[PDB]
From a paper:
Crystals of the T2R‐TTL protein complex, containing two ɑ,β‐tubulin dimers, the stathmin‐protein RB3 and the tubulin tyrosine ligase TTL were grown as described by Prota et al. All of the tested ligands were bound to the maytansine site of the β‐tubulin chain in the T2R‐TTL complex. Maytansine site ligands bind at a shallow pocket at the top of the tubulin β‐subunit where the interaction with a longitudinal aligned tubulin dimer in the protofilament takes place, thereby inhibiting the addition of tubulin subunits at the plus ends of growing microtubules.
Briefly, all compounds form hydrogen‐bonds between the C1‐O and the main chain nitrogen atom of Val181 and between the C24‐O and the side chains of Lys105 and Asn102. The structural analysis of the maytansinoids 3, 5 a–c further reveals that the elimination of the C9‐hydroxy group does not affect the binding mode of the ligands. The heterocycle is anchored by two hydrogen bonds established between the C24‐O and the side‐chains of Asn102 and Lys105, which highlights that the interaction is not affected by the introduction of the double bond. However, the loss of one hydrogen bond between the C9‐OH group and the main chain carbonyl of Gly100 cannot fully account for the observed lower affinities and efficacies of these maytansinoids compared to their hydroxylated analogues, suggesting a contribution by other factors such as compound solubility or decreased stability. The series of compounds lacking the hydroxy group at position C9 showed binding affinities in the 1 μM range (2 720 nM, 3 830 nM, 5 a 1090 nM, 5 b 860 nM), thereby suggesting that the C9‐hydroxy group might serve as a critical anchoring point to allow establishing the interaction with the site. The corresponding signals of the compounds 3 and 6 did not undergo significant changes excluding an involvement of the hydroxy group.
Numbering used by the authors:
A (entry chain B): 2 to 42, 45 to 277, 282 to 360, 369 to 437
B (entry chain A): 1 to 438
C (entry chain F): 1 to 103, 125 to 153, 159 to 175, 179 to 231, 236 to 362, 373 to 382
D (entry chain E): 6 to 28, 44 to 74
Write the structure that this text describes.
């Protein structure tokens, strides 16, 4: 069951590149695409993310999209840049100027058909296509605007496939332009309709973790992307290695999404150290559920968990893992909705991530995620009430009505979460 | 001699069936390549074991079994396993995309694409039968294929084999090893559409098997292999009468006659003893009275429940090993004066006993130790309705909010089928309470 | 940190137990419908025993014994005493009772013994009652003609022990706690629910119920506060009046009756090998005749304690019944027996 | 305590001990429901493609 990966825009490609660098190491694939591993568990499910070519080369099933050549030239010149299929580099020249309208309606529309031809070529040779996973940010123009355009057209051609995304949420703490709330609000509505699973990665949380926890006074995007790499590897562990729980995108969605629109997840990772000490299973569990280890910048105690997916990696006592997971739920049962029995599923993988004897990845569908949408909505309204900066968008054909609707759409999403929190 | 065809559906059904047929071969002396030296009639025969095995001109004994799964990974292991030579490819049916723990996906969407293929492969085995008795269907409640495709297969089997009996071996969902949050949905959906099509169903609660493995075998974190080896022992004790010479439960019809006075109430409680860990260097062999008394301890039942707070409608004792009728009656008399065993007023307070002298067979290197005598009790007690109550309660909690219901409607299933199936379970619980309580 | 739920708001005994558990700082109460609990203070009617003991990693305890109603129902108790060989048809401490359904049923058997009392000169006053209004008549026709308008007709103790001064009736209430191990603990403190009206053998002075005394009795609370006499005072009276002790004259028979009843049903209700554990507080009610003989009147499955004893008893429930299963960081008399 | 119907053979024996005496839809209908479910699927997908077309 193959997965087709897509990374669009600056953020999507810089994070997408680190993702392939991380999992390529975990599966024993070198920069040239040759396998040099010592465990058959590395190759048992290598097909989910890699294509097998001539000479026993493993080529990532990845499509690199952007309206500017800048970031993609960086990837092609990066460490694992040579591993990507050259034909899968689809890029324009104008750029999107951090403008959702440019990526979704003008500049992006001109290039989207080229991307769909590569997606179709990758899908045609798939024995059993699970679906797609997209990495992108919501505050820019290409990943946000054209990314959601791709999602809509991909759904039209592949309506019976799962759509998964890693979506980086903008934050004034780590901001490039003032229009990011506009772009994020327009994109969130697209994700509410056209994705089955979206990992909400908040640049605010990534910054706080680098600053407060990792002790990085001046965090860079590279430092933020290191957290996303480790998180993306953890959330996809059940897809890349043999297992029983959440082993594919659909079964994951069936376990995690009780209502179609409430499919935005809080990812968490443990440990997060600044390092040679062994971490006990009780410690992994406490940190994994600690708000300080999650990437959405939302307090789980301000809401309730609809569903939870836990993944432990490394050689450890699976009996002790079961005990610790049961202790978390039984000691804090008030934070798990009681009308979804046994809503916490736990998976264990023998192969740990690089540089760690054992780790833990947290995937939570909590109603506290509304705090993230409320935040974006407040910032959006602060400018929209004065129609500030709208000319950048009306100049591309958009009408104010479309902004009013996106605003109302997200306030509905917030109300829907608040409904199930009581 | 009348043949029986086994049908394994989904991961649970396939892997459990894989364990049972392995155990069958060890019991009948059939080697992995299908050869059976003790069988002197080459290429044919109407022996008791021929109810489960056909014979080729080359002397191969082939199980009268069919394996069905919507994804190929689990049945592929059978294609390349120790007993790959037993089966031929026509018996192993695999799709490419599974039901994703979605009953509606296994019943309507994907099931409709393969239902005619499975029935055709079943027809090929039925055509080799001179007097087909019926079918034994293995599957889980929680899986999308085990629950969804089984109910479609059970419907069609009633259409194509209206006069044949059908027995179920159903795996009841347990969170300690469950893989989906919606398993309560699938459990009730499949029970609703399958109830009228099953003559006798043996439920096995993974919770009970799990604790029995941890408690009596000293397995810290039991795996499916641990669970299935123990399950195949119970399944073997239940089918032994069909595969060996005897007079009790000699055909599928007799299971319904002896255990099911009421058609809807066709879920007998299975209790097995003793379960001894093979890691213990020596263990005091248990007597007839000791193992018969263990048939009334909830800790040994396939489903945790309290038979003391219910009433019995039937009761069969299946002994394997060094057992003589005199010892059984002595044990029964003692237990009757020390146990709470209430029968329904319209049923005799008695026990149908069957004894097979061959003691239980254990897989070499497995976890179960060899014992001189074992027993499996099949008691139709109203107490087993506690499992329905548990299941129906979890169903109510989620369905009140319509949680996950969109996954089923998205496959063409209507929301009304949910309440229709729940109402059927509500009536089922009411039937049990009428028969069991005053 | 242990967890518990409350599913019976009308429980005055466990409302105090709930208050004590919280005060320990190591018990956290949950919503009444939360499954991840260690302890359930369940409801009286239709407690879902079938849903208990199915929570991985949770030792679950409930404050009721499934099947204990066999002992705490008028008709159930009679049937259990007549049919169980342990108690036998011949029972020296239980009044001759019969189960009569309104127009199995024991009408004809009740009249046979009634006829012998009419045949040979003997006291023929009986009392009719049910679990749901009582009639004390010496004519069988009045009793039966009253039930039509399930009941139990038993012999009325015509020669009861009468306290002086007063010449009045009374009954003895004993509180018995049975833990998960089926240890039988008899609370050292009992209460005599007395009648403030003199006994007239020719219904306020015959029924010792607290509600009847507080509403229908004219001399309510004259002799003792709230028509409740505790053992210390009663024991002194027995010494001053009858030259005996409460232990010798009454307490021996009470402990005997308590053991016999609870040991009888033990095989049916024990949770020794069960996936969940049970304990329960019982309220036994006794009648003492002028011969200093004790008679069992009924057993209560959801009893209320006396005002002065709520603190001591509820604390004892936590000690031996709750903390024994869930340890934190004697006022009972253990009635030993063969398990 | 009555034992009845004792049957013996080389591999074992059976009997009954008594302690006390007492005191379908056609293939047509199935095809309709299966094809009916597929219809609701197609109608839902058609509405999605109509929504995406707008
Ligand atoms: N006892 C036992 N239970 C199993 C086994 N395999 C799966 N299960 C149980 O079956 C339930 C899930 O159903 P599956 O059989 O795995 O799913 P399926 O029938 O293949 O259907 P799909 O959803 O299409 O995969 C879970 O509750 C598991 O605990 C097994 O080998 N032994
Ligand atoms: N057989 C008998 N002989 C003498 N007196 C009797 C009797 N049966 C009942 N009584 C008296 O009548 C009253 C009946 O009490 P009973 O227990 O039957 O009713 P009840 O259940 O409403 C009160 P409780 O539940 O607190 O015991 C008692 O107070 C007792 O004094
Ligand atoms: N975590 C992370 N966030 C980024 C990175 N680059 C840009 N962003 C965020 O993404 C938003 C800008 O979108 P960008 O991807 O640059 O626009 P695009 O190239 O037109 O799609 C801002 O909110 C940035 O904070 C990166 O490398 N890592
Ligand atoms: Ca242009
Ligand atoms: Ca032969
Ligand atoms: Mg940028
Ligand atoms: Mg499966
Ligand atoms: Mg009462």
């Amino acid at each position: 069951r193959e997965i087709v990966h897509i990374q669009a825009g600056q953020c999507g490609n810089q994070i997408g590149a680190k993702f392939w660098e991380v999992i390529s190491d975990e599966h024993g694939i070198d920069p040239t695409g040759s396998y040099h591993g010592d465990s058959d568990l590395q190759l048992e499910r290598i097909n989910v993310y890699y294509n097998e070519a001539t000479g026993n080369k493993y080529v990532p099933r990845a499509i690199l999209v952007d309206l500017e050549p800048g970031t993609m030239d960086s990837v092609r010149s990066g460490p694992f840049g040579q591993i990507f299929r050259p034909d899968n580099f689809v890029f324009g020249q104008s750029g999107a100027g951090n403008n959702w309208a440019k990526g979704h309606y003008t500049e992006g529309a001109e290039l989207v058909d080229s991307v769909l031809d590569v997606v179709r070529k990758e899908s045609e040779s798939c024995d059993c296509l699970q679906g797609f996973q997209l990495t992108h940010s919501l505050g820019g123009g290409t990943g946000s605007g054209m990314g959601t355009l791709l999602i809509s057209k991909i759904r039209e051609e592949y309506p019976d496939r799962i759509m998964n995304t890693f979506s980086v949420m903008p934050s004034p703490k780590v901001s490039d332009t003032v229009v990011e709330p506009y772009n994020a609000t327009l994109s969130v509505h697209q994700l509410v309709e056209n994705t089955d699973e979206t990992y909400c990665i908040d640049n605010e949380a990534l910054y706080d973790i680098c600053f407060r926890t990792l002790k990085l006074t001046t965090p860079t995007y590279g430092d933020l992307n290191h957290l996303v790499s480790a998180t993306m590897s953890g959330v996809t562990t059940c897809l890349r290695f043999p297992g029983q729980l959440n082993a594919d995108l659909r079964k994951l969605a069936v376990n995690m999404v009780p209502f179609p629109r409430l499919h935005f997840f809080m990812p968490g990772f443990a440990p997060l150290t600044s390092q040679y000490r062994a971490l006990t299973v009780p410690e992994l569990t406490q940190q994994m559920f600690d708000s300080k280890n999650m990437m959405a910048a939302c307090d789980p105690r301000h809401g309730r968990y609809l569903t939870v997916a836990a993944i432990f990696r490394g050689r450890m006592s699976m009996k002790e893992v079961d005990e610790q997971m049961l202790n978390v739920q039984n000691k804090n049962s008030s934070y798990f909705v009681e009308w979804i029995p046994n809503n916490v599923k736990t998976a264990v993988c023998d192969i740990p991530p690089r540089g760690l004897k054992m780790s833990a990845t947290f995937i939570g569908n909590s109603t506290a995620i509304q705090e993230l949408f409320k935040r974006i909505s407040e910032q959006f309204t602060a400018m929209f009430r004065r129609k500030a900066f709208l000319h950048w968008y009306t100049g591309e054909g958009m009408d104010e009505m479309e902004f009013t609707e996106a605003e109302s759409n997200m306030n509905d999403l917030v109300s829907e979460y608040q409904q199930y929190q009581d | 001699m009348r043949e029986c065809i086994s049908i394994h559906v989904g991961q649970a059904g396939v892997q459990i069936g894989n364990a049972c047929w392995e155990l069958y071969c060890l019991e009948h002396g059939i080697q992995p390549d299908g050869q059976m030296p003790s069988d002197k009639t080459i290429g044919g025969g109407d022996d008791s074991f021929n109810t489960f095995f056909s014979e080729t001109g080359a002397g191969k004994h082939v199980p009268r079994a069919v394996f069905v799964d919507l994804e190929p990974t689990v049945i592929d292991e059978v294609r390349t396993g120790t007993y790959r030579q037993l089966f031929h490819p026509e018996q192993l049916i695999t799709g490419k995309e599974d039901a994703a723990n979605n009953y509606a996906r296994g019943h309507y969407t994907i099931g409709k694409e393969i239902i005619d293929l499975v029935l055709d492969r079943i027809r090929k085995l039925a055509d080799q039968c001179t007097g087909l008795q019926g079918f034994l269907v293995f599957h889980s409640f929680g899986g999308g294929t085990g629950s969804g495709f089984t109910s479609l297969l059970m419907e069609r089997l009633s259409v194509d084999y209206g006069k044949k009996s059908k027995l179920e071996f159903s795996i009841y969902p347990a969170p300690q090893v469950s893989t989906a949050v919606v398993e309560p949905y699938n459990s009730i959906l499949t029970t609703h559409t399958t109830l009228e099509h099953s003559d006798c169903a043996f439920m096995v609660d993974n919770e009970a098997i799990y604790d029995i493995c941890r408690r009596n075998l000293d397995i810290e974190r039991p795996t499916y292999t641990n669970l299935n080896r123990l399950i195949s022992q119970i399944v073997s004790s239940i089918t032994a009468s069909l595969r060996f010479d005897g007079a009790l439960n000699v055909d599928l019809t007799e299971f319904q006659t002896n255990l099911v006075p009421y058609p809807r109430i066709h879920f007998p409680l299975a209790t097995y003893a003793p379960v001894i860990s093979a890691e213990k260097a020596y263990h005091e062999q248990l007597s007839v009275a000791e193992i018969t008394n263990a048939c009334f301890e909830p800790a040994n039942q396939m489903v945790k429940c309290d038979p003391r707070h219910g009433k019995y409608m039937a009761c069969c004792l299946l002994y394997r090993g060094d057992v003589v009728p005199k010892d059984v009656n002595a044990a029964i008399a003692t237990i009757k004066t020390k146990r709470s065993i209430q029968f329904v007023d319209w049923c005799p307070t008695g026990f149908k006993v069957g004894i097979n002298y061959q003691p239980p067979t254990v897989v070499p290197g497995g976890d179960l130790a060899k014992v001189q005598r074992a027993v499996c009790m099949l008691s139709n007690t109203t107490a087993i309705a506690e499992a329905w109550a548990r299941l129906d309660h979890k169903f109510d909690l989620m369905y009140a909010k319509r949680a996950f219901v969109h996954w089923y409607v998205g496959e063409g299933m209507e929301e009304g089928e949910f309440s229709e199936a729940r109402e059927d379970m509500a009536a089922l619980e009411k039937d049990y309470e009428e028969v069991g309580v005053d | 940190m242990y967890t518990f739920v409350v599913r019976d708001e009308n429980s005055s005994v466990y409302a105090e137990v709930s208050r004590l558990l919280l005060a320990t700082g190591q018990w956290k109460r949950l919503r009444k419908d939360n499954p991840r609990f260690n302890l359930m203070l369940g409801e009286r009617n239709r407690l879902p025993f079938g849903r208990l003991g199915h929570e991985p990693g949770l030792v679950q305890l409930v404050n009721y014994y499934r099947g204990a109603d066999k002992l705490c129902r008028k008709a159930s108790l009679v049937k259990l005493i007549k049919t169980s060989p342990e108690l036998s048809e011949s029972c020296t401490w239980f009044p001759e009772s019969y189960v009569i359904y309104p127009t199995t049923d024991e009408r004809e058997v009740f009249l046979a013994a009634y006829n012998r009392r009419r045949e040979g000169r003997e006291g023929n006053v009986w009392i009719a009652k049910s679990s749901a209004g009582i009639l004390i008549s010496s004519e069988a026709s009045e009793l039966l003609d009253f039930i039509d308008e399930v009941h139990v007709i038993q012999k009325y103790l015509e020669k009861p022990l009468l306290l002086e001064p007063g010449h009045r009736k009374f009954d003895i209430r004993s509180w018995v706690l049975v833990d998960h191990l089926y240890n039988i603990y008899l609370y050292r403190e009992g209460v005599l629910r007395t009648s403030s009206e003199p006994y007239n053998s020719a219904k306020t002075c015959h029924l010792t119920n607290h509600c009847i005394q507080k509403e229908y009795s004219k001399n309510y609370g004259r002799y003792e506060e709230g028509n409740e006499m505790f053992f210390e005072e009663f024991n002194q009276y027995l010494m001053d009046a009858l030259n005996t002790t409460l232990e010798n004259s009454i307490l021996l028979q009470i402990k005997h009756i308590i053991r016999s009843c609870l040991m009888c049903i033990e095989p049916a209700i024990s949770t020794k090998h069960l996936h969940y554990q049970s304990f329960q507080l019982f309220g036994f009610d006794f009648m003492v005749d002028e011969e200093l003989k004790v008679w069992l009147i009924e057993v209560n499955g959801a009893p209320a304690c006396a005002q002065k004893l709520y603190a001591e008893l509820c604390q004892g429930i936590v000690d031996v019944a709750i903390s024994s299963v869930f340890p934190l960081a004697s006022i009972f008399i253990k009635l030993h027996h063969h398990h | 305590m009555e034992v009845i119907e004792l049957n013996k053979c080389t591999s074992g024996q059976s009997f009954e001990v008594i302690l006390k005496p007492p005191s379908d839809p056609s293939l047509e209908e199935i095809q309709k429901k299966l094809e009916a479910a597929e219809e609701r699927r197609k109608y839902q997908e058609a509405e999605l493609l109509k929504h995406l077309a707008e």
